[PDB]
Amino acid sequence: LKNFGKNEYAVRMRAFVNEEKSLLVALTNLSRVIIFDIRTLERLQIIENSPRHGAVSSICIDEECCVLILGTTRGIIDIWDIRFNVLIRSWSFGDHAPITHVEVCQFYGKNSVIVVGGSSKTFLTIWNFVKGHCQYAFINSDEQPSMEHFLPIEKGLEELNFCGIRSLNALSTISV
């Protein structure tokens, strides 16, 4: 990976093999999406997330694997279509903090994605991509959250200043 020329270290790596063809995808040190073909061990294409999103908060692959699901250190959610080689949509919600992880759930199907991050109190935020809403939000608290705060954030822009949490309850691991 030092052959990139900028000497970038691999952040996160996810590989997949379709009966059609097999390949791998990884995030650079500058959080840049690069999909290398497993067959030829060469780079098929290089995708780059907008600098306004900060860095890559997670890595996930679509069911058809024609699309990449990546979170943002700016506390945004970005799904991109590798087919047309562009960014499909950019989403945000809650307290607008950093996204712990992002993945595509099984029972939720490809039409819904599970993302840990966003609002503080909320442990895991599951939102349906097409629906543009969060169907199920698991939160640790003694009371029900605000409906206006839980509503999907769209009109917001890159001007938002990053606010995270240094608490010990932040970093965690999840497998589904």
Binding site: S31, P51, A55, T73, P98, R166
Partner: protein, 50 residues
């Protein structure tokens, strides 16, 4: 004839304004890196607390 020099100056201004974009990117890169490093330091601090 006086319009021409103004046009040229406008072009030079366009290039000069075109440099600040790349400058801004190179800038913001440090902000993103600072964010990531901050996250890592937070996790590490939590581990130290444990």
């Amino acid at each position: 004839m006086t319009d021409d020099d103004l046009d040229g100056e406008l072009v030079r201004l366009q290039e000069k304004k075109v440099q600040l974009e790349n400058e801004k990117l190179q800038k913001l890169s440090d902000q993103n890196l600072m964010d990531l490093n901050n996250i890592q330091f937070n996790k590490n601090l939590q581990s130290l607390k444990l």
